[PDB]
Symmetry: D2
Subunit: 334 residues, 4 copies
């Protein structure tokens, strides 16, 4: 029944020295990308949502080899998303409903999330997630190397407040109809200090005073129309410069950029590869929804197959990563 | 720097009176009736963009109470008592977050002052409305609120739909800042359902909460890239509302993007609404107006009764605007 | 550094159906002794203090064989004391300092105590302890079948309040100089309802309203002089009746009744044996300090040997239990 | 059924003033000076057995303040402001536990009232003392306390010795209800050391605390089966204290078992103490007296300024008793 406070989980599942070092390092490297110091491509890649730790670990084992192999061209970090914003109602992810049956066993959800994150980081795979809920971060944020604020929450002051106090770099998605300005505004908000109410590690509400997050950037995830091409990127960088914030940005191959057709993710990646070969100087990253098995399913019957947005399968993932590595290797050669 | 006192500290210093409790209960029911088309009085959510001075707020409430009473057969008047302001980037977030208006963020003081003003307003017979922006502050005052808003910038946010699903007052969801109505329709859907999520108890500890859903949600047309207040936008919205199986009674904001952020054009929007109410106006249950003692705005809190956030109409024009709506709705209610 | 609330421990170490039922039946069975509805003799027996779980489990397994053997004559419940009152300063028990080295790892101490109690009840051995601290009981009282309030705290209003809200029977010891009245007064006070501050399972202070504890009794543990003989028992019983409370009592064979000399416990047990054969109608229980190996030691060097008060070893334990079982079989047959 | 407000609720409504903090700091230091033989003024813990009416307590404090000033070179006068009462069995546990005196246990109001009264006392220039009975309540007002007692019924209790080890005021431990002095000497030992134990924070959450030990503890002679205030008893206690390596400055209660539970005998005891101070009295650092505006006791709070717990001397006898002790100690100090 009762909610265990973060300290209960931190006590049982303390961050290892390995996990700690991988997080600190990956955050700094990503920061270097955000601010143009390094020209590797951040690739945020993996399932739309985590519903099975076993499949997640297997996926991570395969992805780790590509992370190492392409480490001079790409900085691979896995999607380990525990919180899903629904259009109306639906399963909100492993934390809110881990047994996938409407039992809402949130204590078990948080434990499993933390434990998965700990295991990923211990094997050498850094993790990313969307920070949707205001209280759950205390349970796992120490294990996160990069955070997203979703299209649906980028304009929300309470999420900009949250981002302002997070220790990892944060990407803000443009709004669901394509509005980029709200994400530029969000970087501005989140880079400043805020005072607001939040929950401590002991589970009590408190006034927090944050320092601001210097490592925020935008993510182009499509709108009414896709926004991944060179023209959309150029216009975005112009707007970012006029706002006085970093003009290095991330492109989501999924969602409104593939128009909900997982087979178009490769096409968006190819367009990005062509940008990187021609110039692509404003691109610091890409996002990809990828799993062991392609497509999606309503019920969790098939192993390693998404129960939220459809993903590319492992084979296409190998091709997509090869494609970006080769292209960015050329960008970095200039 | 002081730790956060829990809701119980304030609830105990400032308990709700039987009178305030009765006003809130009754006003929420009356509003539910408007939202579901059972009564044809027009809800008018009117008053300052933000509260920054309780004294001016109380004087405003005294003048407004006279009109609330005068027009009570035509209009259901509820004061805007907004304590939480969503900024485009950065800026003063309202009385709770920064009550001394100087960047000292004395939230404990902000919370008691908000609760105390709300209790005084209800005790004088003036019900209160606010935008629920923050996730943890509502436990401190929600017992004193008769109608709530979820702002344009948060209607699409799952955590705000969650919050709404657990509120005991009717809730209006604004269309998005670029005009997207579908998100507010989706929000009614979400907020009408039960949710499980994390929240904070009255003792100040985090907990898992399980809400029952809010059956009294509606949309608010507040403009986008173009205004959306006219008969054609109302008609299109009503269609979409019916297609989604939710109430097709809606509220129209005369301010913000519908006035094009020009306080002098609220009356223009109100005239258009008045005309709709006289011709038909059957899908309109409410209106929103940004009004203060004195018109305009000011960067610093120098002038008494003048907004430090969005520019408002002043008292004289408020009288005219309200008389306009009362007269027009009298006609609508008289029609066979 | 931060104290985990009881709920953290109750979540990791939930009580089993078996342990739950054992605790429930044992409390019931013991209430029947307290109020004179059954004439079996409660025997609270085991180490002065628990300092090693392994030895506690070995002891328990031997004690279980005798609990079964003597179940028609004796109700055997193990001493599992985790909190020790010191005359001045010293080791306060396994909870306060579980590593025995002055590190005070109280979180570990509490989980270790809870886990031991869970294993004991799961093997069929009910447990008893002294409730000394106001905050720790919430972490394990669900696993306790009988509780003591010590000689040094029986007169304390806060301990009487505590006893008033526990769900197990509770014995109050006469005071360290031999005062019986403070224990009689304690039963009165603890049987009534109290309002006082206590800490919830979530770790927050609260006002609790107890219903009172109707299963309290006195324990004769000696004073300036021993108080175990039939003369002292008779005088205690008259005073008990005069206060309107149960005149069934428990006798400690240890502490000041043995003059702090562990061999003398058997002398006291023999004397009680004589009483149960003659009559002994006011006796409902005895307490005995017993370990695998006899004596004491300042350092935990020898396995199964006390580091607090000296205990009788297993050999003598067998003889003491045989003696009481045989004597009480005769009492019960009358 | 209200929930318990945490100490920060009351601290932010009733913050300690500069003047009150100053008086508390000074008084604790001054008493420490007595405990450790740097000053020879006599600490006098004097006032009602229990506080049950703030109006009467404030009137009493105003009278006592005049005397605190008059005798300040001889006596260090501190008011008894006892909020927590240990009962033999059942009964009214005090103003905190039951402030409306009717079994409604309105503990939030009780704590507020206690804190408010203590704040006003310190603000008028009168330092306050109390018995610390409960493990959770001290956080609400300990900052306003200049001297604390651990009662005879808890001096042997480990949880109370732990509490004492973390308090920032001097603490007196009473001998046992039957006359045992060893338990109080043992308690000073225990309380002088660092402890790790569970306690509650200002925010209302349980926590492990690590105390630094209380170097300012001393014993209180309060009688047992027989009274223990005379020179022979003082001398025997002093020897035992020196044998245990702890301060041999002690306090003598004129009330309770040393007066054989009879309020008219408190003067008898103070007379005896007065002669000890004139002859020698080098081990006596203080005394306790149960005093109110009007003498006696009463079961119902009918008469203003009259005890409803133990019987007290009235204001007239209080003036005489304090004159006595001041006169006698003036001579001790001059030797
Ligand atoms: Mn997705
Ligand atoms: Mn506004
Ligand atoms: Mn022992
Ligand atoms: Mn008294």
């Amino acid at each position: 029944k009762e909610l265990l406070p973060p300290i209960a989980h931190l006590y049982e599942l303390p961050i290892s020295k390995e996990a700690s070092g991988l997080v600190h390092r990956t955050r700094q490297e990503i920061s270097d990308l955000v601010h143009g110091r390094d020209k590797r491509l951040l690739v945020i890649i993996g399932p739309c949502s985590i519903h099975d730790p076993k499949a997640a670990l297997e996926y991570a084992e395969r992805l780790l080899k590509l992370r190492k192999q392409y480490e001079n061209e790409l900085l691979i970090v896995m999607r380990v998303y525990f919180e899903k914003p629904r259009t109306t109602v639906g399963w909100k992810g492993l934390i809110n409903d881990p047994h996938l049956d409407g039992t809402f066993d949130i204590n078990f959800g948080l434990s499993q999330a933390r434990s998965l994150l700990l295991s990923l980081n211990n094997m050498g795979m850094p993790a990313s997630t969307e920070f949707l809920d205001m209280i759950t971060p205390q349970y796992y944020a120490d294990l996160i190397s990069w955070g997203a604020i979703g299209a649906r929450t980028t304009e929300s002051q309470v999420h900009r407040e949250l981002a302002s106090g997070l220790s990892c770099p944060v990407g803000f998605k443009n709004g669901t109809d394509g509005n980029l300005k709200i994400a530029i505004d969000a970087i501005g908000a989140a880079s400043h200090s805020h005072h607001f109410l939040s929950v401590t590690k002991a589970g009590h509400s408190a006034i927090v005073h944050t320092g601001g997050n210097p490592d925020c950037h935008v993510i182009l995830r499509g709108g009414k129309e896709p926004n991944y091409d060179a023209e959309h990127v150029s216009e975005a960088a112009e707007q970012l410069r006029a706002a006085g914030v970093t003009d290095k940005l991330m492109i989501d191959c999924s969602h409104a950029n593939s128009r909900k057709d997982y087979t178009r993710q490769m096409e968006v990646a190819q367009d990005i590869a062509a940008q990187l070969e021609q110039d692509g100087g404003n691109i610091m990253g890409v996002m990809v929804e990828s799993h062991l098995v392609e497509g999606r399913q309503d019920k969790p019957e098939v192993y390693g197959k998404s129960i939220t947005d459809a993903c590319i399968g492992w084979g296409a993932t190998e091709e997509l990563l090869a494609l970006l590595a080769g292209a960015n290797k050329k960008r970095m050669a200039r």
